[PDB]
Amino acid sequence: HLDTALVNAGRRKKYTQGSVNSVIQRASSLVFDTVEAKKHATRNRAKGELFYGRRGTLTHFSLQEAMCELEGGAGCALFPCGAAAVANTILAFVEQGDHVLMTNTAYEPSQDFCTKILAKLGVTTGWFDPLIGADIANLIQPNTKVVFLESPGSITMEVHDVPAIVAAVRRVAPEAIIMIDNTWAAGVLFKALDFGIDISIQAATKYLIGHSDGMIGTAVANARCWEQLCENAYLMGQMIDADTAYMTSRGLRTLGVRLRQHHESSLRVAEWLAQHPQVARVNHPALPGSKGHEFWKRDFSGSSGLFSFVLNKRLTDAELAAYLDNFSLFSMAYSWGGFESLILANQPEHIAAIRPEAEVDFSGTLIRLHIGLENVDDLLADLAAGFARIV
Amino acid sequence: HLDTALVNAGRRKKYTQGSVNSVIQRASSLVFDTVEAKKHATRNRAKGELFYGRRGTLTHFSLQEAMCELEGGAGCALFPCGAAAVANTILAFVEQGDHVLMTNTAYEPSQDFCTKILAKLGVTTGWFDPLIGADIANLIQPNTKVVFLESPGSITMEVHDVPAIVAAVRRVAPEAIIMIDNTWAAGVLFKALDFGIDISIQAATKYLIGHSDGMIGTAVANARCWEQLCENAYLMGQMIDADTAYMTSRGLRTLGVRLRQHHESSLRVAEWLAQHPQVARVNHPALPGSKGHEFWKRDFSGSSGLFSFVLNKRLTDAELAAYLDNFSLFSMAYSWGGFESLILANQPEHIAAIRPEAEVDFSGTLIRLHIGLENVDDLLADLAAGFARIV
Amino acid sequence: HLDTALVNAGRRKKYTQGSVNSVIQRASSLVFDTVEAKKHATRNRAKGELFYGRRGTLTHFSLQEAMCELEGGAGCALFPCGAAAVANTILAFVEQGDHVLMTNTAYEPSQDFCTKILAKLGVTTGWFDPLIGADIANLIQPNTKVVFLESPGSITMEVHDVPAIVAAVRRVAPEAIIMIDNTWAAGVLFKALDFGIDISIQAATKYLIGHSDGMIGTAVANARCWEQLCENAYLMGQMIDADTAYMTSRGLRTLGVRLRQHHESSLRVAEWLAQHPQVARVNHPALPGSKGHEFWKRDFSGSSGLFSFVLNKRLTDAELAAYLDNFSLFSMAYSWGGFESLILANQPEHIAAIRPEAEVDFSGTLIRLHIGLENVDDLLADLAAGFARIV
Amino acid sequence: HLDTALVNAGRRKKYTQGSVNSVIQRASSLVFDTVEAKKHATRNRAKGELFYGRRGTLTHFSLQEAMCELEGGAGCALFPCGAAAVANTILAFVEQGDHVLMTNTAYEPSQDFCTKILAKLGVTTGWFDPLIGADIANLIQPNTKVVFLESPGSITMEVHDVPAIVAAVRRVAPEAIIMIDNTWAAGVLFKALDFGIDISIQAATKYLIGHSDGMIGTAVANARCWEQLCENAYLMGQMIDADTAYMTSRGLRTLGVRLRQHHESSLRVAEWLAQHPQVARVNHPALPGSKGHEFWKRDFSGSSGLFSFVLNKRLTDAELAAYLDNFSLFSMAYSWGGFESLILANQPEHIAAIRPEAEVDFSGTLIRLHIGLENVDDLLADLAAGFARIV
Ligand SMILES: Cc1ncc(COP(=O)(O)O)c(CNCC(=O)O)c1O
Ligand SMILES: Cc1ncc(COP(=O)(O)O)c(CNCC(=O)O)c1O
Ligand SMILES: Cc1ncc(COP(=O)(O)O)c(CNCC(=O)O)c1O
Ligand SMILES: Cc1ncc(COP(=O)(O)O)c(CNCC(=O)O)c1O
């Protein structure tokens, strides 16, 4: 029933006022007809009554309701982008003297927030290998407050054993705040809260928006953590504009059909790459043999379209240009989750530099692909032409 | 020449591409045609080359250029709202052990960020009376890193003697970061950076947007402080959407003709209130006798339309409803800076509770007015009817 | 390669300027830097140079290029909605004394334009049964200027034999303008201009927008008819706003994946209805046995999700309310082509009244369904519950 | 009280739902909760009940209410631009055999609609000098259905004696439909429907939008003519998108303070030009001695900022480039009514060619200026520098 839920989540008449989609209510000022209405709005300023634009309008409330339904949460906080959701969700739960334990495959801006901002504020960060599983218990310190997961990992796509990690954390520090950056799954292919994670964070920028033309972050928390997340993020002034909230709700309505196509196409590309003589390794959560693939198969309900692979050699700078500059359909850009296919390259030492306290286990150039909605045979031909430029 | 500058600031062909206003470029992904173009964009990712949507698109670059011209700064950082600009601009310059010195008339959410977020990060906040002037030197501690001004003050409208404050800070701690919330002046009626302030922060939500239908914060920094502001705000994921950036640029184009009307009308209302038997005090920076009026007359080039007054009595709850619930033109809402007139009330003890380490010097109910663009005689008739309901 | 074409159509650097999607250029005024540039823009004011907002901005040019590529036309005119495209495209080619020959299954507002507007301007209109095929030749008068097709027909879904109609028209009246309302096919499941039709009109409101939140009409003409269409529509001031043009281009990027789901789901529902004891007839072009199905099978490349069926009785007012008022997933609304499922009822005598010079051949209430993106088993359960309410 | 009316027109709780401005309701489909509600909406589909997006959503209804209040009409029809409003408002009231009598100073596209569209549909058009006054009676034919006014005229700015024209029409042809293109007055500086005109048409593109970034037309009709205008324009599919309707309502809120500045600055420039040795004539309705000034003074409540003047020679193309290419503040573009100043040149023989059955009474190049919101002394200096380039 996920497709039905995606079509209907948040679409109630109090928000739509007769249209199919929520109205767009643009506001800072929200008007109180009487002193008693103002008092009521104040009491309910975080409970869906119109109070002030920084808390939201009908358009935001509709999106928040949709996200809570789809991710099974008590509340959804909104942010100007994914990086803001990560940074402010972590910040909401720490004080000076605390420790954060974060996967070494976390998105680089998330790491840099920890090492360049949190550290200044008296909050330390330690690191773990994404396949650590139950052994994470040994890394929990007396002051560990937050455990931060990201599955699959950024770039290299390792999938955590979330049940093993969560069980170990709860044994040692049942009160800890467990968070996950659930962007790759779009919050719906992995139902994080059902696994005992406290907060599921997404760059709604990616698959929820789905068209590469809006930026927005979300964080859906369970009942234990919601009030602290909501109020501390509000104290940092975190919000999103009404129009982007509308566009995120709108993206939900095609998320199912889109994801099924990204899954089908990216798996086909990954299977083809795995047979290719110029490819050393394919990092796709759905491909047999990929790191944590057995946890993806057990714990996820599908795949998206982002993955990576390692070439059979380290490209020279001349080869990198010959390869990347001459694609016809794949484009070079950051971000992903849109309708179009993207390609980027990283050398192994570049990845090692963003794997704290760890090395990488490959020596070829790594290529990250986002597989969009183009015909897959056309995408395969584009990749084949690229291989011919470097063979 | 301010009106000419407001019409033209940021409106260059590289952003407008033939239209009068900037194009609206909605993006996360920004495409690099070659590896070398990507390297160039990376080196210039904070210098106006398209790199990634979190840094901005053409639409943001146009607004940033306009704000730097109008406020005389080296760079302009963008935020989802004014409160995010205040919180993240302060956060960008502090670390555990630092001290912030803030006017006791600061906007309440700014105070709450200090007491409820900064405090648990090991950053202490002290307070000063807005008329302290040169005596602020005695409050500067070895660990004072930030001095935070707001002139006129929130609600009660006291105007600082900025030249005296800045000179005192520079004598004792010249490296300190002096910031101002310059929202009431819309950043243009008081040229903060020409007075030796380091960073001018605004809720562009107010007069820059001008229509009560968008939220956005700005912070314009001098060359000394720009890199740290830019990079630390970016690590917190702070940005605004392209469409709100467009609407802020658009608001600049009528800001001069709007502010002149708000000034003319609000001063007429303030002069009338000052003669009224039911009014104890009028707090309008432009009205003779108001706190810091001589600094407003010396240091500002105009007034906006927000001010307050104190009634000759403390209204009962029944009188508050009779007064506020029955206006025909003034509405109750938070925010201000739009085309319509607004009214709110506060009891003295409510204000005292947001004047840290200080008491208030009045006992009547305080009324805050925003004077919009309606005909002033109609607004006066509405206020007169209000007075008759409580006489 | 249609999916690749849909992802990339119109997305050239001159329109996108570095983002994935076109920029949104909002304009009436377009600025000429020199008199020489103004002269060049004037000469090329219908050839893709920026001249005046009524002709379009970069955003419109990008959509027009996409529509010409996808429908194989020489030019694409834009209109405020589908009905404006129909009315103004017909008007662009008639003058007093002319005759229009239109299918009797044409959309009712299209018929009303002919009988209420054209008739008082000296232009007569005659009618044909949608399955007339080659016998249309005997209805062509010496003054027949326009032959207007709609396949499938509105409401009742009959599919024309376009090859037989076009061949008959060209034998008798080679210079006639053959037009089609190609909305049901979204202009891509039936390539009208490859069949010898001169102009393909769409309510881009439906599947191109795809989300029920924008209105826009398009008309794509061959080289023979383009100049007259363009210039006469322009004389009537026909245009669309830049933002809706952007959203139409954006809809193209998911059109393929959406249509495949609408086809799969709607055919499954039709097959179930076609064996259902409370259903007298199913009108779905893709269902064997439906009127004109053999032509759909030969001439179309797929199906959308709009179709109708006839109940085993004419519902009374109490029965119609018990049926329609209590659906859980299907909603009552006009329009279609969006992500959500819709239901409407038409009584047979109502349809007969909008079948000029013709009778209907059924007596039960007709139900028109739009099958959206919800889970099809959930939709079937909703329809089954409906049947139980009227059994 | 106009400023108060402009701030408040159309801003009722049913449309704003708690915000200051209307909600933006984007919709084709509008959902009926029950068959009973659909029946009610159908009966009232042109009477302000939500029925279908082509009729409008809450956002349109709010704008329509505002326009009817401000112009004193029974209804307001919306169109994609001003030219569509003119063409479709005329078309709504003519049939084969009718005659249209139009001022020879009408906007050129309005003339071209008459000569190129209406003529081939059996509707003839004749012409009259804008100062004809009461002598227009002699030109009214038995089949004259529409008398079309435009005051001030396009380009040359002549002001009609509307009382004299209307009285003559009513004496000879009381049932005629009298229309005016009231764009220059923004519908509010000349209350056309109080002078016995039946329909006031505007390019809301100009001063109502006020920022050069939207296009929209309006036609406000009296009770006698509303139903025919509404229903015939709807049969042509004429509508505007919800977002442009919102931006038009939003423009009303600053229209008063904008127009006062355009009046002040443009009259100052006109007075300067009227004493300048390089100027042969100044065409500004507010300038004493301009054609029809005495009617402007009697019948209008203010002036906008668009006017023209005639140079002391017909400039060559080389002089036009030297003059126009090198302005610093004035830009070349079509349209007007925005915040920036614009300049265009018209040769006398080109104007004569769009003065049907009449000649011009000047031989110098005509310069049309739009005076924006820049500082007027800067604009005067820009014009002076232009004079020096051609002296
Ligand atoms: C896994 C993951 N988490 C957060 C972000 C940041 O979201 P944004 O809206 O961009 O602030 C991303 C961003 N990725 C860019 C890239 O991978 O190229 C992310 O992938
Ligand atoms: C002086 C001042 N500074 C910051 C803000 C916050 O801006 P926002 O965009 O709302 O986050 C304000 C806000 N004012 C609301 C009120 O005064 O009622 C402000 O006044
Ligand atoms: C087949 C077909 N052709 C034109 C239109 C009109 O488009 P719009 O954008 O609404 O002006 C439609 C519209 N139909 C409404 C309905 O079927 O309920 C159409 O179906
Ligand atoms: C007086 C007058 N009436 C109608 C229009 C057309 O409006 P639009 O929204 O542009 O279709 C205009 C147009 N003017 C362009 C120009 O004068 O340069 C007009 O002036």
Side-chain angles (χ1 to χ4, degrees), chain A residues 212-236:
Chain A
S212 311
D213 65 348
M215 303 191 61
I216 167 175
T218 60
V220 177
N222 65 16
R224 180 173 74 106
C225 297
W226 167 239
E227 188 179 19
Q228 178 164 1
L229 172 59
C230 179
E231 296 305 310
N232 288 348
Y234 187 76
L235 281 161
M236 296 300 297

Side-chain angles (χ1 to χ4, degrees), chain C residues 28-29 31-32 34-35 52 54 81 95-96 107 120 206 212-213 215 232 237-238 241 325 332 334-335, chain D residues 28-29 31-32 34-35 38 52 54 81 95-96 107 120 206 212 232 237-238 241 325 332 334-335:
Chain C
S28 56
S29 297
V31 178
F32 312 111
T34 60
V35 178
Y52 183 59
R54 201 186 307 128
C81 65
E95 62 188 39
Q96 69 171 334
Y107 183 52
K120 72 186 180 189
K206 280 68 170 99
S212 307
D213 65 346
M215 300 191 61
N232 286 348
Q238 298 306 282
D241 65 289
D325 291 354
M332 281 182 288
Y334 290 105
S335 200
Chain D
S28 53
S29 297
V31 180
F32 310 111
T34 63
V35 176
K38 183 179 171 295
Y52 184 60
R54 201 186 309 129
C81 65
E95 61 187 40
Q96 186 179 36
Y107 186 51
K120 74 192 178 174
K206 278 66 168 111
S212 308
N232 285 347
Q238 297 305 284
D241 66 288
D325 291 354
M332 286 182 277
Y334 291 106
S335 198

Side-chain angles (χ1 to χ4, degrees), chain A residues 81-83 107 150 154 181 183 203 205-206 215 334-336 368, chain B residues 52 54:
Chain A
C81 64
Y107 185 51
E150 182 174 332
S154 279
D181 184 333
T183 300
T205 303
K206 283 79 169 71
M215 303 191 61
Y334 291 113
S335 200
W336 45 273
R368 194 183 71 176
Chain B
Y52 184 56
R54 205 189 302 131

Side-chain angles (χ1 to χ4, degrees), chain C residues 3 23 53 93 101 106 125 157 207 245 247 250 261 278 281 284 293 311 325:
Chain C
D3 279 344
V23 301
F93 290 87
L101 188 53
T125 300
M157 318 306 308
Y207 284 106
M247 292 304 291
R250 195 179 186 270
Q261 191 60 77
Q278 296 173 247
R281 188 184 299 179
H284 191 312
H293 163 75
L311 288 167
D325 291 354

Side-chain angles (χ1 to χ4, degrees), chain A residues 262-300:
Chain A
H262 294 292
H263 181 161
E264 174 188 276
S265 294
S266 75
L267 179 58
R268 177 92 295 274
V269 177
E271 287 166 343
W272 176 83
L273 289 166
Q275 301 301 320
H276 199 285
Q278 293 170 253
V279 174
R281 188 183 307 180
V282 179
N283 308 313
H284 190 305
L287 187 79
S290 197
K291 295 190 183 177
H293 167 71
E294 299 295 328
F295 314 130
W296 172 87
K297 189 170 188 198
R298 185 189 64 200
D299 297 338
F300 288 62

